[PDB]
Design a binder for this molecule. Structure first.
Ligand SMILES: OC[C@H]1O[C@H](O[C@H]2[C@H](O)[C@@H](O)[C@@H](O)O[C@@H]2CO)[C@H](O)[C@@H](O)[C@@H]1O
Length: 461
């Protein structure tokens, strides 16, 4: 499925992929070899499904937190450059791509979130989170609002949850301890309570996503947003006059974002391994290669010393590195994808009012330690689709009548939209193993025995 004598590359659709295609045209004009760039949907989950049997791209781009799990499954080739090349990039960027003693990818650039504001609507931005409710009121009298950002992905809400004390896994004596999880302490509860109260008092809406918020800022309808360096380009095209600065404090403490390093790995089953090393070391990681990508969509603070010393004179970049020093570098261990699925479910149920804050975070502490939890959620979704709409109305009636603990209110059931919402409510209230046991019990009481049997052989077994 992988053809000898050319190169195929995969990268996310919010980065500068037309700029990267210009670098491959130059490689073709010096050697004749053709390069193709693609941007599929959900690529961080498609890559481990196709590469296990030897298919996929020659080269894959993503942040460093996903790569430890790919290496444990045997999907990547080892990286081995000469000491003369290694001295061209900062030593702290090589530390982020080192796993069990070996290097497993090439580092490209450093990314962190900041606060972006409209100078004509608000020439002096606020220094604390506590000030935002009163400022929303002044702006409505002009037909506007104060702040809008993406509420569906937990990367954007984590800086406030961590300000007064929350954490992922505890670091002690040279290693992360995978059975000491920090999403349910006193500091984590206070930050999530402040976010839900903004929604209750009608300063924000619970269905806001990435493209809704991007259009409102660029049209002048809102005063502030929260985003990374890749977004600066489309703002330049618009009519808005903008600045970039440090995030606000909470209870007197700084906000603390998680920082990522964009990186490039090589497929263990590729037959083009030495063509791939020549493209990356001699064409992309140079002054003129990185300049072509940066002009399409900006990269942040790059890994190559000779070019980063010039970019550091830009005041937008100085603010990016101040937020990075108040935050923390992400771990790369294989347990990180189970952590991100658990926190995503907790924020969605609490912002929509289907669960209380305290009950949602106590279940996340348990789900974050279970490797197979997200797989169980996908098998529940498929069983609800197979019942059909008439039989699924009977299922939801019996769930609302249960007297066993924990109980589910009838108002919360009427607010669901489809089969994906129902599977997320079940794993968030009961945790993942108990969710399957209760579902099988209700299916037997409405006489749907074939569906219950198929679900059992693919989970608890
Ligand atoms: O929301 C969970 C998600 O966060 C990070 O993904 C970022 C990525 O690093 C950025 O480059 C940008 O594309 O936005 C993404 C969030 O929408 C983690 O790297 C990722 O593993 C995680 O699932």
């Amino acid at each position: 499925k992988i053809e000898e004598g050319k190169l195929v590359i995969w990268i996310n659709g919010d980065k500068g992929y037309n700029g990267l295609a210009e670098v491959g045209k130059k490689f073709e004009k010096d050697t004749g070899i053709k390069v193709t760039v693609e941007h599929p949907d959900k690529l961080e989950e498609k890559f481990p499904q196709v590469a296990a049997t030897g298919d996929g791209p020659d080269i894959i781009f993503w942040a460093h937190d996903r790569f430890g799990g790919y290496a444990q499954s045997g999907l990547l080739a080892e990286i081995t450059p000469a000491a003369a090349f290694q001295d061209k990039l900062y030593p702290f960027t090589w530390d982020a791509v080192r796993y069990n003693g070996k290097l497993i990818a090439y580092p490209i650039a450093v990314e962190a979130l900041s606060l972006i504001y409209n100078k004509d609507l608000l020439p002096n931005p606020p220094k604390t989170w506590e000030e935002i409710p009163a400022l929303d009121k002044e702006l409505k009298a002009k037909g506007k609002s104060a702040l809008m950002f993406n509420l569906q992905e937990p990367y954007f809400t984590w800086p406030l949850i961590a300000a007064d004390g929350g954490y992922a896994f505890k670091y002690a004596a040279g290693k992360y301890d995978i059975k000491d999880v920090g999403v349910d302490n006193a500091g984590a509860k206070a930050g999530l309570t402040f976010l839900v109260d903004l929604i209750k008092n009608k300063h924000m809406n619970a269905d806001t996503d990435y493209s809704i918020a991007e259009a409102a800022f660029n049209k002048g309808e809102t005063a502030m947003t929260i985003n990374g360096p890749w977004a600066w380009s489309n703002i330049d095209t618009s009519a808005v006059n903008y600045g970039v600065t440090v995030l606000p404090t909470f209870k007197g403490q700084p906000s603390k974002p998680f920082v990522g390093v964009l990186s490039a790995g090589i497929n263990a089953a590729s037959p083009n391994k030495e063509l791939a090393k020549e493209f990356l070391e001699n064409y992309l990681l140079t002054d003129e290669g990185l300049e072509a990508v940066n002009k399409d969509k900006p990269l942040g603070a790059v890994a190559l010393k000779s070019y980063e010393e010039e970019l550091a004179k830009d005041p937008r970049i100085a603010a990016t590195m101040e937020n990075a020093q108040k935050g923390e570098i992400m771990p790369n261990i294989p347990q990180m994808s189970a952590f991100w699925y658990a926190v995503r479910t907790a924020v969605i149920n609490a912002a929509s009012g289907r669960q209380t804050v305290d009950a949602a975070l106590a279940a996340a502490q348990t789900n974050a330690a279970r490797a197979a939890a997200e797989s169980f959620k996908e098998h529940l979704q498929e069983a609800f689709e197979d019942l059909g709409a008439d039989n699924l109305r009977k299922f939801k009636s019996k769930l609302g009548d249960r007297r066993q603990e924990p109980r589910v209110t009838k108002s919360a059931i009427e607010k669901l939209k489809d089969e994906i919402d129902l599977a997320d409510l079940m794993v968030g209230v009961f945790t993942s193993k108990d969710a399957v046991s209760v579902t099988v019990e209700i299916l037997r009481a409405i006489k749907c025995n074939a569906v219950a049997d198929d679900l059992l052989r693919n989970t608890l077994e």
